[PDB]
């Protein structure tokens, strides 16, 4: 009986930026999903394609944990069939998604007196992201009618802009840390199951 490394993922000191979401592959371990649901820290625990109480009763080949940090109002965009900057150009869930999304406030952990500007998100992209697709290229985006030869200009914008996380800002702008647990049974063998 060896528990999965949920503690490292959820209690990591630093969370990767949303534009390049951190991905962790969990397998060959027993996962105690009941512990996550029992904790009241998580503000949002929307689950798609399965009921949380029955979650420990099903087995999956791999569990992909996608960890990032997004502002309060943009956590809504983390849902199948949703539109927005985070949904389209940063992290796109498939319409047929079998998994859960967990989000909790992290105002004290992230925001500072001067403001936490470390986290940054992608503003522009030529085409909408396919499900579970991540792009970290920083080519100078072109808005059309002129190529800038990779030089910032009027219609040529750098794709990445940094969040301003002030300590006393509104609830909408406060930093919410989000982990998306996607359960995938890729083929016949299954290694992840709940405790007996």
């Amino acid at each position, epitope marked *: 009986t060896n528990l999965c490394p949920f503690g490292e993922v959820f209690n990591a000191t630093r969370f990767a930026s949303v534009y390049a979401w951190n991905r962790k592959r969990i397998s060959n371990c027993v996962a105690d999903y009941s512990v996550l649901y029992n904790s009241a820290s998580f503000s949002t625990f929307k689950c798609y394609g399965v009921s949380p109480t029955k979650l420990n009763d099903l087995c999956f080949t791999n569990v992909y944990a996608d960890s990032f940090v997004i502002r309060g109002d943009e956590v809504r965009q983390i849902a199948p069939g949703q539109t927005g*900057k985070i949904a389209d150009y940063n992290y796109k869930l498939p319409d047929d998604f079998t998994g859960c999304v967990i989000a909790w406030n992290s105002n004290n952990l992230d925001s500072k007196v001067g*403001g936490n*500007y*470390n986290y*940054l998100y992608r*503003l522009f992209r030529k085409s909408n992201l396919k499900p579970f697709e991540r792009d970290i290229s*920083t080519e100078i985006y072109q808005a*059309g*009618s*002129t190529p*800038c030869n990779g030089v*910032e*200009g*009027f*219609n*040529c*914008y*750098f794709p*990445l*802009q*940094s*969040y*301003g996380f*002030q300590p006393t*800002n509104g609830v909408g*702008y406060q930093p919410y840390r989000v982990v998306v647990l996607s359960f995938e049974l890729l083929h016949a063998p299954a290694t992840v199951c709940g405790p007996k």
Partner: antibody
Amino acid sequence: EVQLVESGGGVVQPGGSLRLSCVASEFTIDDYAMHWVRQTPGKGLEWVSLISGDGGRTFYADSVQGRFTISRDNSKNSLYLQMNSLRSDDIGLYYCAKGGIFYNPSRFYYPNGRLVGSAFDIWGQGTMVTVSS
Amino acid sequence: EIVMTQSPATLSVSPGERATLSCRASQNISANLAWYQQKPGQAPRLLIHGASTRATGVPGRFSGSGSGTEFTLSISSLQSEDFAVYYCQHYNNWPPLTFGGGTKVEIK
């Protein structure tokens, strides 16, 4: 075409208060750093106020930094300028604008960030305010 | 902080002739100076974004040139539709943006 329609400006006695509201049609202002630009009749265009994409970082002109306050509402697609204690120098048309994105400081922009591509391609119709007794 | 100055105060030039407008800046701009034209009764519209890159929907007669401290706007041919006031705005890194004085283009 992409449009900007403003309202709320009007004649007022000196020392009064006015609020200007500019509404954006046929596009989104979520990321762009919108400007308020004053064109005094007989004078060239004068940049007055700026707001960031998320509203966190707001800049003002040296003359009107004390009084004017700019806010934005992305959900309602609106820009509000709360003028206070108007002076004789503030008598002129006021234009909404869509400048380039204001990049908050980050790894790529360490010294306080930069304003990239702040050319006003989209201009509103204008709402003239008058400081008259 | 920086000052943008247009050398031509007023250019009364007959239609069908090249027009030259000179814009000078206090600090090195590194080709970040747009141009605007304003006909009476209308809001000024973007004409040339960047030092010389012509903008969308602009006839090819308008051209830009120069870099660094000095920039230039050249009208290849002057028509009855080219009478307006021209301002050379700058969009440098910091947002104390400064416009230009303006040039008066008049008939004959």
